[PDB]
Symmetry: C3
Subunit: 543 residues, 3 copies
């Protein structure tokens, strides 16, 4: 029977039969079932002997610190893992029962409680976020470092599916072609919830966060260090949700970490949602002179050819910035940012194109100077501004087209704004006695319109009559001077004349006349510039 | 050997070894394989003893009524389940071989056949949808109630994957943190295909429909009762497809059910597609005085703070409304609705923002009064109307910006329409001898333009000449009065004058003159309002 | 014990216990584990006896040619399969280290190397793509046909999950309700990476490519032949990524293959990304007289009622066309195409609607005549053109609305362009001394504006003064003739007059006067058309 049984049954060992995880790992052939809670000590390392295993978790891994998995064969899968710390730390919860953010350090300190979730352990970044909190926090709430972390080290082709936990963290160190799939809402600890760190060895490649949701945590939900997906953009974050990150939803590290670069290139950031991060929705910058990376002489600060594939992202409720990045030669599309306390978008980009961007009700707490900032020479095609709620857009070197929304024109600063390809136009006016097409030369005034074409009702609704007027600003008084057609249904043109003797230089073109007033004779004269360019003054109207 | 075998093999029991499902459930330790069809009786209840099981289905559960699973441990997974009724009911199929909807009750009654799919059992809502069908339906086709339902009751953390069936239904009753994942196109029965009902106990939370597709069914594909995802929006529908729902694709219940509220809050509805529902694509309203919910004194009807996260939805072919909802303080974005028989969008919302909405060819059967209706004071930023096919938009209290499409201006009714931030403009005219920029004051007339700025060709194409004309409406005749520049390439301005003696009140501003006709002397006069405001009549031109 | 063991353990056989795959297949009951590499010969066929199996792959299937799986029961699942050829062919790599495409045949021939990835085997389509390469390629690099293909034949309800490989191919022949799910980046061979071919038997239905990523391959990544998803659109490509396809990312075949039609209907193509295809991003055309399909007399060429559901697609870096299709009565939405060498969109469609299309920096290598081409009578609602880089759009029979971007108006050709529903307008000018609203009648000139309304600064910034001018083109000189209001802050209107004796036909309307110059008396005259229509010439101004 043994011979037969050996050939007809699925192989799997279960933790309940062993004293240690390493013993179970050593006995494993195909499957490994975690069927009893396991308390691990920080730094406990398991060697899987290069075996391609299917680890099914139906119990918890309990401990503060890292449980290190090494030598898992390519194709190994871990499903249902649940990390939980032994320590219950002091956490702050910077939001109210009405989901309003608390910005006052004293109000935030008052939220302190011991819990493994529904808040996060304060870190030094909170000292910046809630000014003065550093001196108000009790010593037992400062410098905590609790995280129950599953560390997969130097493995290739290992996937973690439906992971969860309390004060949990997942770290892929020196890995490639690894994925964090369908995370079942782990509640984060002190460190990043899902981190792909490749500071040693080759640049990380093929590392992804696919689907799932992540909550809380003291720092960023998902983070990458020294990863390069190559031209194929093999790596990144797709289809994920981040809720209430202590720092940002997604963060590609910037600057030097250790003696090398922590920057990232060629990754995808698509079809994702980030809600209520304490800092930013997406922090995709690379610069904060670049050991291990491109020299500043080759690519200036904030001008690295990051080449990320960025599309279809939604950010809502950030206490910081909705979407931030730097880099040169980027193409970004379909970004929607709503209800953010700081800038909806903070772009330190150059020679980049932004298509179909919607920044709705951001910088609601005046944390920044504008709702959207772009430093370099970029192109914006389709920009929706203003929802239902300091410049709105400050992109001094950018050319923009297609802004929609109830924007205050005086709060727009761009290099060039144009609608070169509209067809025949109709201006439809609702709730007013007139329709208008205004012109504003920002060089002259950002607050006053320099001229206009209006249509005003004569009499009342249903009169079937209106008058058209062409205006010009004078003495900083909009519409000071105007020509009217059909005022009071008179069917004639009312023409403005120079109130005094017209100077020779008032007339511009040949074969034109400019009427002027000669008060001493109660006459209307006309300065005429003959077709030959010569000036002559004629009498136009008299008593 | 037994000792060894017990430690090296994967545990799983299979239904073929037991007489009843409960017996198999009682023997189960890790896996449970459904390897033989099982006929269950309505109300048959299985107690899983709190075990965390992996139930793999490779056969059907056959029966009319509910098969109730209870006490499944957190982390349990059911995959491949297939529900099928024992009864083959009478179903109607309200569409033709060309996929045209049938709206005539007699034509619909004629489609009657006995089948477990490709149609649905008529319900009372059909009496409303196809007027008169109630009296035409034969008695054996009325009041049917066939559904083979898998009911998961009061469980936490249970997921159902790749479910399918015929006349199938899936009901999570009193559950939390449960998911219906990658449904493999079950064909629905009388009840909802996937329902999360939490009328008793705590409000449902963490309940999701993730991916998959659902077809037919007499009522809504996915439905939620008394679920609240909290600030974290933990719950909802993401990435799913609904085809031909007897009622709606997605429905959040409204009103009182029993002695409590069936309403829902804080859920996500994203990246989903609903095609051909008999009623609506998405029915996300909460109100139809609110036992178990907010009092009408706190939040008026249709003004509950639902706070759903709604983004990236596509609806096509609804016989009813594409997208419907109510509520206050909502942010909705990226909705595309095409080819609907009733309104594309029916919004009973207040103080809400709608960004990038596309309503293309809706209300094609004039079921409603408009293509898009918004009752309250909302903001619309980016609205695309008209495809290739009664007001188009009726949002009396809303402010709109960014409408694109061949809309008939007379079919627009909003509180305010404006393009405050366009740049320098160019109106490009194709196929006509002129380009135009028209002005229409809706208060004066919704059908006639009150004035215009035109450019007309002089001679023919390639003449290199055109004349510009500024017009005004008079006597309800558009462009009745006008000033022209360069008519017939004359290089002069043609000026209109009052056809008779100008009355003193015809002139508006100081330092302006208004020419008028004095027929009895064949003279042109000029009513002049001197710079000092005084009126004087001068002779302008004579024989 | 045997009795007990037989009832409590999971059944699974493993390849390591058998000499051939068929032997393992015959012994299988529930699971089948591929735990050792298996070298198969081309055409090796395995009969699974109608069993519903779960095949778990933890090793490779090695061989050139097809490994044919037949008679798998409905519900069977294959996970982790890895196909690899025995031959290492000669492949070309038409791109540089900077990711620039190589278009020169000699430069491409120089990339030749023997490898199972990072390039592809040249085919006859390359002879067209890189002109002259046919004669430059060494004979050992021509006509190669290496592909290690898993062929699933005539099965229903079989899913392949997380497949991978080198020179790999996956072919579903005569299958229905089959899915290729979460492909783990297989590197393609000579044939399509995932193909659903239904040339024999019923039209394919329920066949999908869900998620995953595919790379390289000589032809298209995903391809369909004779599939019809029905009204329910049961089939297609959703959520996938294609990188560097030798031909196109997605291809629905066109024309006759064998003695039947290879065309496809009613499929979904959504939420997908295609990057760097050598040919096109999406090739969704059906026509290239139609055996096995609609006769040309019923539906003319390129006018088949394909009815695909197309939404949310992104294409970047195509050496060919970004998005291409034909058909009549289509609704297409939310397409974003960036940085393509050939046309961003090539549409041989009629009576179709395109909503929210963004074509950014395409036809960068002038491969085609335009960035977007539409042949038939279509409607475009929302079109974003120009990023940071020959007509731009040539849609002679289409009506368009909502173009945004820095488009050159002279490069637009459409049947009608209009913005019928804008509200009150403001033209904001940045960086210039004037704001402008120009009018261009394309029938008159596609390069010159026929008239304009300008506002120009008087003096300098902060002067609080500007003049408004209405212009008209004459003698092909834009703004040749104009009326000004407030030039040099004079507060009067400068009026142009006919430089010579005005001919009777110069005046257009009654009750209007046209000033003209009478040089011989240094007088300004006025041709007057009295309110009764009669002409009279009066003296207007004199010395």
């Amino acid at each position: 029977y043994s011979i037969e049984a050996d050939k007809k049954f699925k192989y799997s060992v279960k933790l309940s039969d062993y004293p240690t995880l390493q013993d179970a790992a050593s006995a494993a052939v195909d499957g490994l079932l975690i069927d009893r809670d396991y308390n691990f000590y920080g730094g406990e390392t398991v060697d899987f002997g290069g075996k391609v295993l299917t680890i099914e978790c139906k119990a918890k891994f309990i401990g503060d610190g890292n449980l290190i998995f090494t030598k898992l064969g390519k194709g190994s899968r871990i499903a249902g893992v649940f990390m939980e710390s032994t320590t219950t730390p002091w956490v702050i919860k910077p939001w109210t029962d009405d989901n309003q953010w608390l910005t006052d350090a004293a109000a935030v300190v008052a939220t302190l409680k011991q819990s493994k979730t529904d808040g996060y352990q304060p870190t030094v970044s909170d000292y910046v976020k809630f000014p003065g909190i550093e001196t108000l926090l009790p010593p037992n709430a400062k410098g905590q470092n609790i995280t129950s972390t599953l560390e997969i080290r130097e493995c290739i082709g290992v996937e973690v599916h439906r992971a969860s936990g309390l004060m949990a963290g997942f770290l892929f160190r020196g890995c490639h072609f690894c994925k964090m799939v369908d995370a079942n809402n782990p509640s984060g600890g002190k460190d990043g919830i899902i981190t792909f760190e490749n500071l040693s060895g080759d640049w990380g490649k093929g590392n992804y966060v696919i689907g799932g949701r992540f909550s809380y945590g003291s720092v960023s939900s998902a983070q990458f260090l020294r990863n390069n997906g190559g031209f194929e953009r093999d790596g990144g974050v797709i289809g994920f949700t981040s809720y209430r990150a202590g720092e940002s939803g997604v963060k590609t590290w910037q600057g030097t970490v250790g003696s090398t670069t922590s920057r990232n290139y060629n990754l995808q950031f698509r079809d994702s949602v980030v809600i209520y991060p304490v800092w930013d929705g997406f922090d995709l910058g690379a610069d904060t002179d670049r050991p291990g990376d491109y020299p500043i002489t080759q690519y200036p600060l904030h001008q690295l050819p990051l080449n990320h594939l960025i599309d279809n992202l939604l950010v809502r409720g950030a206490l910081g910035v909705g979407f931030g990045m730097d880099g040169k030669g980027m193409y970004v599309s379909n970004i929607t940012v709503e209800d953010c306390a700081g800038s909806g978008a903070y772009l330190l980009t150059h020679e980049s194109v932004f298509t179909n961007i919607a920044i709705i009700d951001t910088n609601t707490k005046d944390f920044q100077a504008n709702q959207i900032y772009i430093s370099g020479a970029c192109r914006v095609n389709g920009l929706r501004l203003i929802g239902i709620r300091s410049l709105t857009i400050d992109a001094p070197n950018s050319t923009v087209s297609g802004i929609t929304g109830m924007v205050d024109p005086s709060r727009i600063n761009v290099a060039n704004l144009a609608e070169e390809g509209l067809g025949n136009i109709r201006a439809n006016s609702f709730g007013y006695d007139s329709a208008a097409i205004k012109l504003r030369i920002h060089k002259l005034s950002k607050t006053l319109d320099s001229g206009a074409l209006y249509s005003h009702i004569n009499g009342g609704a249903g009169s079937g009559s209106a008058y058209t007027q062409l205006t010009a600003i004078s003495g900083s008084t909009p519409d000071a001077v105007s020509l009217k057609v059909n005022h009071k249904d008179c069917r004639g043109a009312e023409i403005p004349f120079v109130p005094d003797i017209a100077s020779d230089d008032f007339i511009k073109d040949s074969s034109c006349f400019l009427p002027y007033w000669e008060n001493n004779s109660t006459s209307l004269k006309a300065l005429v510039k003959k077709p030959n360019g010569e000036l002559v003054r004629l009498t136009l109207a008299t008593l």
